[PDB]
Design goal:
This is part of a larger assembly, with two copies of chain A (48 residues). With 48 residues, chain A is mainly β. The first copy, chain A, has no helices and three strands. Chain B: This is Spike protein S1.
């Protein structure tokens, strides 16, 4: 998310086993980063 | 750093005035402050 010059990231790396969908269970996301970039971002694309 | 003795302080721009002691308050890697039910700065972690 972008707020006040800050794009921001959070993350979790978790083991699961389900092929189909987002497992149902709760865990929450610490920040990794903050980037004081100042871009405006209206769109994005992943990469593979 | 001084302990057990009333001091003014600033940490990382967090300020306040207190008695800085040694506390077994397991913090988080990205965690900066502590706080408390009353919303009053409590524990801190020495930035250095």
């Amino acid at each position: 998310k972008n707020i006040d010059g800050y794009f921001k990231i959070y993350s979790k790396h978790t083991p699961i086993n389900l092929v189909r969908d987002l497992p149902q269970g709760f865990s929450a996301l610490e920040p990794l980063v903050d980037l004081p970039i100042g871009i405006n971002i209206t769109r994005f694309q992943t990469l593979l | 750093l001084v302990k057990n003795k009333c001091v003014n302080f600033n940490f990382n721009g967090l300020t306040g005035t207190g008695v800085l002691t040694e506390s077994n308050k397991k913090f988080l890697p990205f965690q900066q402050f502590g706080r408390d039910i009353a919303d009053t700065t409590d524990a801190v972690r020495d930035p250095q």
